[PDB]
Amino acid sequence: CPLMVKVLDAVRGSPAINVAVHVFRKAADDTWEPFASGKTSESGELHGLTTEEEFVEGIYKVEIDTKSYWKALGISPFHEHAEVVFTANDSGPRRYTIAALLSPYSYSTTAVVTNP
Amino acid sequence: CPLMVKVLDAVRGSPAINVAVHVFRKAADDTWEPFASGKTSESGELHGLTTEEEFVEGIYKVEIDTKSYWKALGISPFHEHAEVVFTANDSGPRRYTIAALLSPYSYSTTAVVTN
Amino acid sequence: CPLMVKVLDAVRGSPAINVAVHVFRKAADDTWEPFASGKTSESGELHGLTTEEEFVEGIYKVEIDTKSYWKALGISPFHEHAEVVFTANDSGPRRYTIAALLSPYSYSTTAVVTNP
Amino acid sequence: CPLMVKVLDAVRGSPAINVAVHVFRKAADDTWEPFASGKTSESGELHGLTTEEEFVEGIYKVEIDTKSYWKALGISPFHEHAEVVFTANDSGPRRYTIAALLSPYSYSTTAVVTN
Numbered sequence: 001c002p003l004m005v006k007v008l009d010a011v012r013g014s015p016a017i018n019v020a021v022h023v024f025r026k027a028a029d030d031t032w033e034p035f036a037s038g039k040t041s042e043s044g045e046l047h048g049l050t051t052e053e054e055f056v057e058g059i060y061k062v063e064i065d066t067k068s069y070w071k072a073l074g075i076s077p078f079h080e081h082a083e084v085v086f087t088a089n090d091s092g093p094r095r096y097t098i099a100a101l102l103s104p105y106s107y108s109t110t111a112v113v114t115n116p
Numbered sequence: 117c118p119l120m121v122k123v124l125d126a127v128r129g130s131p132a133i134n135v136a137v138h139v140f141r142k143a144a145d146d147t148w149e150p151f152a153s154g155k156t157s158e159s160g161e162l163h164g165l166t167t168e169e170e171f172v173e174g175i176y177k178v179e180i181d182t183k184s185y186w187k188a189l190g191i192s193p194f195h196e197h198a199e200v201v202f203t204a205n206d207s208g209p210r211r212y213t214i215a216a217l218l219s220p221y222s223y224s225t226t227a228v229v230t231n
Numbered sequence: 232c233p234l235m236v237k238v239l240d241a242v243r244g245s246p247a248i249n250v251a252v253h254v255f256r257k258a259a260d261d262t263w264e265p266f267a268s269g270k271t272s273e274s275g276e277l278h279g280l281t282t283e284e285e286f287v288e289g290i291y292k293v294e295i296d297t298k299s300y301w302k303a304l305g306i307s308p309f310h311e312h313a314e315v316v317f318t319a320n321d322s323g324p325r326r327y328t329i330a331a332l333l334s335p336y337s338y339s340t341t342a343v344v345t346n347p
Numbered sequence: 348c349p350l351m352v353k354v355l356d357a358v359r360g361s362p363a364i365n366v367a368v369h370v371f372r373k374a375a376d377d378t379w380e381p382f383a384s385g386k387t388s389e390s391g392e393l394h395g396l397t398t399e400e401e402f403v404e405g406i407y408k409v410e411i412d413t414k415s416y417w418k419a420l421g422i423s424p425f426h427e428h429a430e431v432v433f434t435a436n437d438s439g440p441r442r443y444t445i446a447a448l449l450s451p452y453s454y455s456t457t458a459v460v461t462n
């Protein structure tokens with residue numbers, strides 16, 4: 001429950017379905033270690049990536065594979081992916097929704113951070 | 117000079133050219149009075165809408181005809197237009213750029229207010 | 232169920248709570264008639280505005296009172312409100328989520344349109 | 348000339364000034380090689396990063412240090428930075444403007460690619 005990703009398509013006005021998402025966590029030696037991955041559902045949501053126990057303090061990167069999404073719709077987009085990089089749980093455990101809104105040459109991302 | 121509008125296209129990655137823009141000022145009876153209008157340039161910009169003397173404090177509406185733009189590109193849009201409504205304030209900075217970034221089902225707008 | 236409004240705050244990373252929302256529908260004489268209104272909940276969502284029977288084809292305007300929201304947080308924002316104007320149900324009944332992401336000098340809006 | 352970065356501040360309604368920006372090119376071993384960097388100007392712009400000859404096709408990353416910017420304003424930010432990753436392509440248009448609009452918990456970016 002502590003990390004969820006939601007992806008919307010600004011061209012079609014719909015969830016962005018079947019988008020690949022890779023999460024990484026910065027290690028002590030400053031490299032990016034693979035942490036979790038998955039794909040968005042029919043609702044454009046990806047749940048279940050991690051657990052309260054596993055999701056410790058750290059710097060996390062959420063890489064959303066926007067380029068494969070657009071190419072499967074016949075569009076050659078600008079970006080390789082959308083990356084969202086952030087420190088998590090620095091003030092204690094929180095619940096993070098990482099939302100992204102996609103267009104071929106543009107994206108936006110926002111975080112909704114809540115305290116259970 | 118005090119008011120400029122800049123419009124970008126998030127699908128094509130380009131200025132949004134030949135977009136109609138109408139500006140209105142709110143009247144004492146709360147109706148919207150036509151004030152200025154134009155079409156964006158090849159750089160997506162619309163300059164020269166008003167003057168320093170004319171652009172007095174008040175509530176203004178900038179209406180961007182996004183629907184006609186998407187229709188021209190053959191892409192089904194959601195909005196009828198994008199409307200940006202704001203109060204012009206003499207105390208702060210003196211130049212207003214109203215920027216808008218367009219997608220068929222989404223738009224964003226920001227104000228860049230400077231001296 | 233056919234019209235929902237969801238509002239997020241891009242400064243705090245949270246739902247935008249207690250935001251006033253007024254919906255209007257363009258009448259045959261081309262004026263804006265009041266249609267529904269409400270305020271966002273603790274989750275930043277406003278449900279229950281209308282019904283499948285009432286929400287006929289038409290041009291609708293959703294006016295989100297962003298200026299009162301920012302002022303109560305001590306911020307003097309740029310916009311008077313965010314307005315979202317759109318034709319609804321032109322191809323038959325649909326389910327519309329109107330989402331808005333707010334900052335003091337900027338907002339974005341997107342629509343998620345689904346077919347039940 | 349072929350690559351420019353423009354950064355805006357959605358809280359203050361202003362250019363985002365003195366923002367550090369680093370550009371990287373992806374190497375054959377998939378590491379990120381430093382390529383160019385600078386700080387945005389009083390207009391929020393960073394010009395002169397590269398040249399027509401140097402800016403060959405490849406995968407580029409533009410990393411905008413948003414966290415330091417919000418720290419300077421005393422506002423708690425979410426992201427460590429904003430990263431924009433793209434392939435540069437000779438067939439299409441020749442000038443790339445990478446624009447970004449910053450809020451403490453959100454950012455948006457668009458590419459304006461023109462001749």
Ligand SMILES: NCCCCCCNC(=O)c1ccc2nc(-c3cc(Cl)cc(Cl)c3)oc2c1
Pocket residue numbers: 006008099100101108109110222232233234235237239326327328330331332339340341343345
């Ligand atoms: N009739 C019922 C139909 C319901 C469809 C699903 C409801 N959907 C949301 O409850 C929801 C949740 C987070 C969202 N985050 C954004 C967002 C993100 C960015 Cl980066 C920019 C912008 Cl403009 C919006 O929209 C959301 C919607």
Ligand SMILES: NCCCCCCNC(=O)c1ccc2nc(-c3cc(Cl)cc(Cl)c3)oc2c1
Pocket residue numbers: 120122124211213215216217224225226228353355446447448455456457
């Ligand atoms: N005396 C000189 C008067 C100068 C007025 C300022 C002109 N200003 C622009 O030329 C400009 C350029 C790129 C922009 N990129 C955005 C942008 C990006 C995103 Cl991601 C979202 C949104 Cl809403 C906007 O706005 C721009 C404005």
